[PDB]
């Protein structure tokens, strides 16, 4: 989580998609799903972002439709949006031990007790919290068990991106479980 307010420049797809859905929380709008291979994804739209303007206009107060109808309306040339870096959520830094535990139980990515004299008790990670992203790989959707592998695969060293729970049910409520396994991307940014 960076504390910056950064510009992106975006440009429709060949079928006039930019790749987005964006929900109006308390006043603002928020990035909802960024679909995989799309021009949101490769400009570094994440989950949780928040959009405080599209083509310098200011999203304050828009309803998701409005967001929606925004975006459809505009010439897809080139749209800029000003971003403010995932608010809601904050990175925790964490350390496997020699059996590989970082010493947490979670159930559907939502973390639900830490692991007495763990690295996770020591770096302060907190229950009722939505796991979002792993070393900076958003993992929203996945199943338990693939959360669990990407655990394993990483080095010693684990970053975990997490929000509190009414917030994140908040934030994907009204959109299908399936599409946010099938749609949300869930890849290594590319350079
Ligand atoms: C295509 O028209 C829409 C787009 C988004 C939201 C809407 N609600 C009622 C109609 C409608």
């Given at each position: ?21 964006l929900?109006?929380?308390?006043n ?23 959009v ?5 206009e ?20 080139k ?35 830490i ?16 796991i ?12 338990d ?13 684990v970053t ?32």
């Amino acid at each position: 989580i960076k504390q910056g307010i950064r510009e992106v420049i975006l440009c429709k797809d060949q079928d006039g998609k930019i790749g987005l859905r964006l929900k109006s929380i308390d006043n603002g709008i928020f990035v909802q799903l960024v679909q995989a291979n799309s021009p949101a994804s490769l400009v570094g739209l994440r989950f949780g972002d928040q959009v405080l303007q599209i083509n310098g206009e200011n999203c304050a107060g828009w309803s998701s439709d409005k967001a929606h109808k925004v975006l459809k309306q505009a010439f897809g040339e080139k749209i800029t949006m000003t971003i403010r870096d995932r608010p809601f959520e904050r990175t925790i830094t964490m350390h496997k031990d020699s059996t590989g535990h970082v010493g947490f139980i979670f159930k559907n990515g939502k973390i639900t007790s830490i692991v007495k004299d763990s690295s996770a008790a020591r770096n302060g990670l907190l229950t009722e919290h939505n796991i979002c992203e792993i070393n900076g790989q958003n993992v929203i959707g996945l199943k338990d068990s693939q959360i669990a592998d990407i655990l394993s695969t990483s080095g010693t060293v684990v970053t975990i991106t997490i929000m509190p729970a009414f917030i994140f049910e908040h934030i994907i409520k009204r959109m299908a479980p399936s599409i946010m396994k099938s749609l949300m991307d869930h890849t290594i940014p590319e350079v």
